[PDB]
Design a protein around this ligand. Structure first.
Ligand code: A1IH0
Ligand code: A1IH0
Ligand code: A1IH0
Ligand code: PLM
Ligand code: PLM
Ligand code: PLM
Lengths: 143, 143, 143
């Protein structure tokens, strides 16, 4: 029961730590630009490091939801692979935005690809779950 | 094991796609008002479309947590129904805010109703889980 | 199957309600300072109550992910205990920030401790899951 989800649990834990890294990066930018909380505004660089964090934070439950649904209704290893791709693309996203708001686009689109890939695999897993029973009951109309 | 959660997995996937739609709406408003990232400020309409997104993003894990706990400790179909009600109310919430910050209140309160409904069903499911064992051990004090 | 997760389901439901309380607190501060949505800016007190909410909202899925992974791969009761510690530290965090942005640091670091504690227990639970099979297959190289 726990073995069939252990790769998804590993990839989830990686995602949590990746978010702890992003929080450390924003904490470090708060000292590197003297931005006192509750302020979110500063130079065109504090805002970029900070927004990259804010975005990744928002997108994290979308990642968790898809990783777990794709991992349980389609291959767990396949879902764990896109889960690693997404997370890695996010490090690049953050690192790119932390430079210019342009250098974030390419790893942002890489993150999108992995997110749609998980959505498709979750969709195909649920389709393959409900469709045969539907096709069976639908064709059960002949009488 | 996966059949008893397949409706919750479906409703979760709907929620993920609803969030992808909200992100597309904010991306479209960024071009329709020339709002360059990392800026979140613009006309009284870019901010509304953008805030509606920000709010739905925040409330998504609350929806996921409740949908799954209510779906596992009370009827899965019942939880999947409020889960559909909440998500539908959110589309209206977004669409209302995307007009005026007043026209969002009614579908916002509809979303709240569905959220409290899931909380109650999760609460009743856990109550019915722990209470009989408590009542039994408590009454086991007579000696 | 549901009994071995019932404490994590309880602690999750507590977290959801704690977030509903934080939303009520921000709604009350919006009337107590006449801050019309979609504005997030006001006195040095509306922003603090509001930011405390925004932060807790962000950190909630990190809490959920860790609580559930630690609860399933290490003791459920132990994970449910740190889960209660984290949530309680968050009430103090909110209440401290709602006063000064300094009085939030101590319950913020208390919240961090509980978060790293869950991460370690999830890590130890997965380590103990994968490591024996690895050590076995690795030592299986003698031939
Ligand atoms: O030492 C750190 C930085 C750690 C780090 C980050 C990136 C790369 C390498 C090391 N921090 C303190 C606690 C920290 C913020 C303050 C509140 C909090 O809950 N935190 C938290 C605790 C546990 C978890 Cl698993 C989590 F995701 C968040 C994170 C940053
Ligand atoms: O084409 C789209 C729009 C799709 C759409 C939206 C509403 C209605 C109809 C179609 N987008 C690109 C990728 C998008 C943002 C960029 C990063 C990212 O992760 N994305 C993401 C990818 C997959 C998932 Cl399932 C997700 F939730 C988010 C979403 C918007
Ligand atoms: O009466 C309340 C306040 C309740 C409260 C808060 C703290 C302590 C004691 C009582 N509110 C209305 C609905 C509320 C916001 C509007 C939209 C929404 O979804 N909401 C929501 C509904 C259900 C859940 Cl379980 C949730 F987390 C959020 C929360 C605040
Ligand atoms: C919030 C992300 C989805 C949670 C995953 C639920 C999977 C339960 C496993 C049933 C067997
Ligand atoms: C983060 C939302 C809760 C996740 C749902 C956990 C349900 C596990 C199923 C145990 C049987
Ligand atoms: C998003 C938080 C993690 C969800 C927990 C998944 C646990 C499934 C139980 C498998 C047995």
């Amino acid at each position: 029961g726990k073995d069939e989800v252990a790769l998804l649990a590993a990839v989830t834990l990686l995602g949590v730590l990746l978010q702890a890294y992003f929080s450390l990066q924003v904490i470090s930018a708060r000292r590197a630009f003297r931005v006192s909380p509750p302020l979110t505004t500063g130079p065109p660089e504090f805002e970029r490091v900070y927004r990259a964090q804010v975005n990744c934070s928002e997108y994290f439950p979308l990642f968790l939801a898809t990783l777990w649904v794709a991992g349980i209704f389609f291959h767990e290893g396949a879902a764990a692979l896109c889960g690693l791709v997404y997370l890695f693309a996010r490090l690049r996203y953050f690192q790119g935005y932390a430079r210019s708001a342009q250098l974030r686009l390419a790893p942002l689109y890489a993150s999108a690809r992995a997110l749609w890939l998980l959505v498709a695999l979750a969709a195909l897993g649920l389709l393959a779950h409900f469709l045969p029973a539907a096709l069976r009951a639908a064709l059960l109309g002949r009488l």
